[PDB]
Design an enzyme around this catalytic site. Structure first.
Site, PDB file in Angstrom:
ATOM      1  N   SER A   1       3.037   4.822  -3.918  1.00  0.00           N
ATOM      2  CA  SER A   1       3.924   3.830  -3.403  1.00  0.00           C
ATOM      3  C   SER A   1       5.247   4.519  -3.009  1.00  0.00           C
ATOM      4  O   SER A   1       5.198   5.434  -2.217  1.00  0.00           O
ATOM      5  CB  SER A   1       3.997   2.665  -4.385  1.00  0.00           C
ATOM      6  OG  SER A   1       4.586   1.521  -3.799  1.00  0.00           O
TER       7      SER A   1
ATOM      8  N   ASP B   1      -4.259  -4.485   0.202  1.00  0.00           N
ATOM      9  CA  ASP B   1      -3.075  -4.153  -0.561  1.00  0.00           C
ATOM     10  C   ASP B   1      -1.921  -5.089  -0.154  1.00  0.00           C
ATOM     11  O   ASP B   1      -1.516  -5.023   1.017  1.00  0.00           O
ATOM     12  CB  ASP B   1      -2.734  -2.687  -0.268  1.00  0.00           C
ATOM     13  CG  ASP B   1      -1.533  -2.175  -1.048  1.00  0.00           C
ATOM     14  OD1 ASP B   1      -0.618  -2.981  -1.309  1.00  0.00           O
ATOM     15  OD2 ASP B   1      -1.444  -0.965  -1.370  1.00  0.00           O
TER      16      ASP B   1
ATOM     17  N   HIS C   1      -2.538  -2.575  -5.099  1.00  0.00           N
ATOM     18  CA  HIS C   1      -1.481  -1.605  -4.815  1.00  0.00           C
ATOM     19  C   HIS C   1      -1.448  -0.444  -5.808  1.00  0.00           C
ATOM     20  O   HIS C   1      -0.854   0.596  -5.481  1.00  0.00           O
ATOM     21  CB  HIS C   1      -0.117  -2.335  -4.815  1.00  0.00           C
ATOM     22  CG  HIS C   1       0.972  -1.526  -4.222  1.00  0.00           C
ATOM     23  ND1 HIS C   1       0.992  -1.127  -2.920  1.00  0.00           N
ATOM     24  CD2 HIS C   1       2.038  -0.974  -4.827  1.00  0.00           C
ATOM     25  CE1 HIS C   1       2.056  -0.330  -2.747  1.00  0.00           C
ATOM     26  NE2 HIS C   1       2.725  -0.253  -3.861  1.00  0.00           N
TER      27      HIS C   1
END
Length: 271
Positions: A97, A219, A248
């Protein structure tokens, strides 16, 4: 102890292998524990560096300098300080991320320190723009920040299932809800705003180390087209693998599917 860099980031090095050094860097709302399913696969061939991003739940909030972290550069400087202190000549960097972008940014300054970046659940911009789909409008962000500020605990409880995806009673959803709520609420709101309003698209041409772009097919925060965007705009070689996972943090929630994919991208180089 390596000193303050170790203490501040709860840094750990595990594994005794000789093929290389791997650095694992987590996303917002989790901590190095997100990598619990990956690390056992790496310790035979690698030395594995794990650390918590400043502001993460397990870190001392007194070290959170809002001016430093008002842009993503602050986190990239922290990563470069870790690599400098470890005396790393080169690493394989896996960034989840926001840490995907943090590693990319650091690699622009010091491409020599990175043999490859594995960009997991990565996005250079969450907001939509002209001819660019990120998955969010400003009104969506404003509603999210208002929820965070109104009752952070309730926000964590509602957001975690959406972000992790899949069964809302899963151990992964529960874990993420708890790590989200470990962040001090002022840090959480500030950081979420910094990350969700970020736009590093114009930096991508400067990234020249090879990039492996890995994400879930579904996601919350990353439309699949973002992987194609990254692949078409990064300044060096890249490959994309969209996994048949949802969520995610798929290395936490669906490791049976995801860990084999991450291991492959760590072990196999693009031509």
């Amino acid at each position: 102890s390596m000193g303050i860099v170790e203490e501040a980031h709860n840094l750990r090095v595990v594994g005794e292998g000789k093929r290389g050094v791997i650095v694992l860097a987590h996303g917002f709302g989790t901590d190095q524990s997100v990598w619990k399913h990956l690390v056992p696969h790496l310790v035979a061939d690698y030395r594995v560096v794990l650390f918590d991003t400043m502001g993460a739940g397990p870190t001392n909030p007194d070290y959170f300098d809002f001016s430093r972290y008002a842009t993503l550069e602050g986190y990239a400087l922290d990563l470069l300080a870790i690599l400098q202190e470890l005396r790393v000549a080169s690493c394989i960097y896996v960034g989840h991320s926001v840490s995907a972008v943090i590693g990319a940014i650091a690699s622009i300054s010091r491409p020599d320190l990175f043999s490859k970046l594995v960009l997991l659940s990565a996005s250079p911009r969450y907001l939509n723009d002209v001819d660019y789909y990120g998955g969010f409008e400003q009104e969506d962000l404003d509603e999210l920040f208002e929820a965070m500020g109104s009752n952070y605990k309730a926000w964590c409880s509602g957001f975690a299932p959406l972000c992790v995806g899949g069964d809302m009673e899963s151990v992964a959803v529960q874990e993420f809800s708890r790590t989200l709520f470990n962040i001090r609420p002022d840090i959480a709101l500030s950081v979420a705003q910094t990350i969700f309003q970020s736009d590093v698209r114009s930096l991508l041409p400067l990234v020249t180390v090879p990039c492996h772009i890995v994400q879930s097919t579904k996601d919350l925060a990353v439309p699949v087209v973002v992987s194609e965007y990254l692949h078409k705009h990064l300044g060096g070689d890249s490959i994309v693998e969209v996994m048949p996972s949802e969520g995610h943090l798929p290395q936490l929630s669906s490791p049976d599917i995801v860990i084999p994919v991450l291991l492959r991208h760590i072990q196999h180089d693009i031509a």
